[PDB]
Structure formats: structure tokens, C-alpha cells
Amino acid sequence: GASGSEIPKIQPFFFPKNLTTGKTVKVICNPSEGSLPFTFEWLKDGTQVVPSAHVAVKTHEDYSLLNIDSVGWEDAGNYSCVLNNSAGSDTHTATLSVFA
Amino acid sequence: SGSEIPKIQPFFFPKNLTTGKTVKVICNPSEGSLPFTFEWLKDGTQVVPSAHVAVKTHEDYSLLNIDSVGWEDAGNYSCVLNNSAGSDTHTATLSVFA
Ligand code: NA
Ligand code: NA
Ligand code: NA
Ligand code: NA
Ligand code: NA
Ligand code: NA
Ligand code: NA
Ligand code: NA
């Protein structure tokens, strides 16, 4: 029937604060509001995240999971999720710090 | 090897929850040996899934999803993370503006 077209709104996500070398960290990007369907994009410090042996992105219909194993200093930085549907887009950026 | 005790990555609920929002939180280890099992509690009692409350557990994380959150969903949610070597629990408060 009538299809509501609602701009998406990202649920704010943040990284843990005393993360030390070698640990695993996960964050989720998901809408709190918005019409289906959703697309997700992850950025790190100005470029799209590239999956690797220790970095993985797993995207579902209504959320996307960023996983980093064996964190090191190179994994520190600002990670952004860009969320879109057919009505609009939203973005959230979270800073990851990695300590010795 | 394979006997590293689990430790949950601290999780928290958003601070902007209004009635009707979808909310998701994940429980996952920052350390610990695979395989894991997960349990969710609400105010000390295991979560009962329903039409608008879903628990989806994967190999290395568990997802709590609440559609159309309301005042009745407010409470203290615990994730219990288990493996062969031990157990950890983390609890976070879900608050809803009304
Ligand atoms: Na956090
Ligand atoms: Na998280
Ligand atoms: Na992932
Ligand atoms: Na760094
Ligand atoms: Na940035
Ligand atoms: Na976009
Ligand atoms: Na109880
Ligand atoms: Na799910």
C-alpha cells in the first residue's frame, strides 16, 4: 500500500576507551529510524575500509558490523559509517584509540 | 592453549532513545578462546524473545534487537559470555525518554 519514505538516522556508536594492543574490537552501525532498504559504507581516515586478514565488514539488511582483530596502532583513527536508503543519508564518526 | 578466559567488550545503550526507535546492542569478547556461548538477561531474568525483541547469537557475538522501543523495555540488560575456561558478565541500562 502506501509506503512511508523516512530518512535514515544512525544509532550513535563509539569505540571502547582503554583498548590495548592485540585485543579484538567490534562496532555496529544500524538505523534507529528510516525506511528500508539500507546500504552501509565504512570509512577510515578518509578512505573506504579495506577488509583484510584482521579487518572484516559484515553487512546485513539492517546493520553492519566492523571487526578488528589483534589491534595495533595502525588501526587507530576515525571510522565513519555512511547509511543510506531511498529517502536520504546519515553519517556517524567514532574515534578508535589504541594503547600499548 | 584454547583456555583464555573471556572478557566482554563494554557495551552501552544510546542516550537518545525515544518511543518507537529501533535499538541494537552487540555483546562480543575483546579476548577469550573460541567457542563461546551467550545469554542475555533483563533485570536478572533471561530475555524472552518476542515479535519486537530478538536475540541473534553468532559465533563471536550476540545481537540484542528491540523494535519500537518503549518504556516497558527500560531496564538493566546483562550479557553473559561463557567458554571452556570461564565466564564474564556485562550489564548496561536501557533508558527511554517519555
Ligand atoms: Na564504547
Ligand atoms: Na559495540
Ligand atoms: Na565484521
Ligand atoms: Na595510532
Ligand atoms: Na573523520
Ligand atoms: Na551517502
Ligand atoms: Na530477575
Ligand atoms: Na537479526
TrEMBL record, chain B:
Ig-like domain ranges (all copies): 6-95
**Disulfide bridges in this chain:** C27-C79
Report which superkingdom the organism of origin falls in.
Eukaryota
Question: Per its record, how is this protein called by name?
Answer: Dscam
Q: Which organism does this record belong to? A: Olivierus martensii (Manchurian scorpion)
The lineage, from the top, is:
Eukaryota, Metazoa, Ecdysozoa, Arthropoda, Chelicerata
